[PDB]
C-alpha cells in the first residue's frame, strides 16, 4: 500500500491485536467494555474496508472514464 | 533451371532414402536444413521438387510455411531410371524390415 493505507492498517491491526489478545487470555465480558468503544467510534478499527480497486477497461483512461468521442 | 549435378543427385537420393522431404519456404536460406554438407541451398531444393511435382512424380502439400513433398508410385520408377536403381531397392516408407 501507500502512506495512508499503512496508517490505517497499523491502527486497525493494533485494535484487532489487543482485542484478540484480550479475548484469548482474559474475560470477554471486559473485552466487550472496550470493543463497544471501538465500534462506536470507528467500525473500520476492527473491520477491514472491502473496497480495493477496479480494473481498467479498453474504452477509456480509467475503469469507468471513457475517451473523448467526436462527431464532426 | 540450373543446378550442379551433385546437388541434383543428392536431393534425389534423399527423396529415395525416405519417400518424404520437407523444406521451409525460404529461397534465401544459405543451405537446406538437411543435407547442408552437400553445399546446396533451400532454393535448389524448392525448384527441383516443383519440377518433379509438375511432371507428376511428387505430390505437394503446404502447411504454415513448409512444403511436404511425397513420393508417388509413378515417381518411384522414374527415380529408378534416373539414379540407375534395380527393381529391388525401395524407400523406407515403402518397406521397413519386411
Amino acid at each position: 500500500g501507500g502512506h495512508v493505507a499503512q496508517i490505517y492498517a497499523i491502527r486497525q491491526s493494533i485494535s484487532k491485536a489487543l482485542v484478540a489478545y484480550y479475548q484469548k487470555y482474559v474475560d470477554e465480558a471486559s473485552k466487550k467494555e472496550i470493543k463497544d468503544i471501538l465500534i462506536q467510534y470507528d467500525r473500520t478499527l476492527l473491520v477491514a474496508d472491502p473496497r480495493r480497486c477496479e480494473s481498467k477497461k479498453f474504452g477509456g483512461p480509467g475503469a469507468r472514464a471513457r475517451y473523448q468521442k467526436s462527431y464532426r | 533451371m540450373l543446378m550442379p549435378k551433385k546437388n541434383r543427385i543428392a536431393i534425389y537420393e534423399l527423396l529415395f532414402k525416405e519417400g518424404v522431404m520437407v523444406a521451409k519456404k525460404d529461397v534465401h536460406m544459405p543451405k537446406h536444413p538437411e543435407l547442408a554438407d552437400k553445399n546446396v541451398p533451400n532454393l535448389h531444393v524448392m525448384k527441383a521438387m516443383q519440377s518433379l511435382k509438375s511432371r507428376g512424380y511428387v505430390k505437394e502439400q503446404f502447411a504454415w510455411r513448409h512444403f511436404y513433398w511425397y513420393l508417388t508410385n509413378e515417381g518411384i520408377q522414374y527415380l529408378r531410371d534416373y539414379l540407375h536403381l534395380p527393381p529391388e531397392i525401395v524407400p523406407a516408407t515403402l518397406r521397413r524390415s519386411r
Binding site: - | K25, H28, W64, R65
Partner: protein, 55 residues
C-alpha cells in the same frame, strides 16, 4: 540475382527481419513469449495454442 547484391542489404534487426510464422506477414507481429505470430493469425489459433478468454 547476382550473388553480390541479391541479399546484400543487412536485415539483422528491424521490422523486415521478422515475419509471421504462419503467413509470413510483416505487420502486427506478436513476439511476446516467443510467439512470433501475426496478430489476426493468433486470434485464429488462440484456442489451439491454449489461450482462453477468461475475462
Amino acid at each position: 540475382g547476382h550473388q553480390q547484391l541479391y541479399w546484400s542489404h543487412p536485415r539483422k534487426f528491424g521490422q523486415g527481419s521478422r515475419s509471421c510464422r504462419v503467413c509470413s506477414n510483416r505487420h502486427g507481429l506478436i513476439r511476446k513469449y516467443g510467439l512470433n505470430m501475426c496478430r489476426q493469425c493468433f486470434r485464429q489459433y488462440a484456442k489451439d495454442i491454449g489461450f482462453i478468454k477468461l475475462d
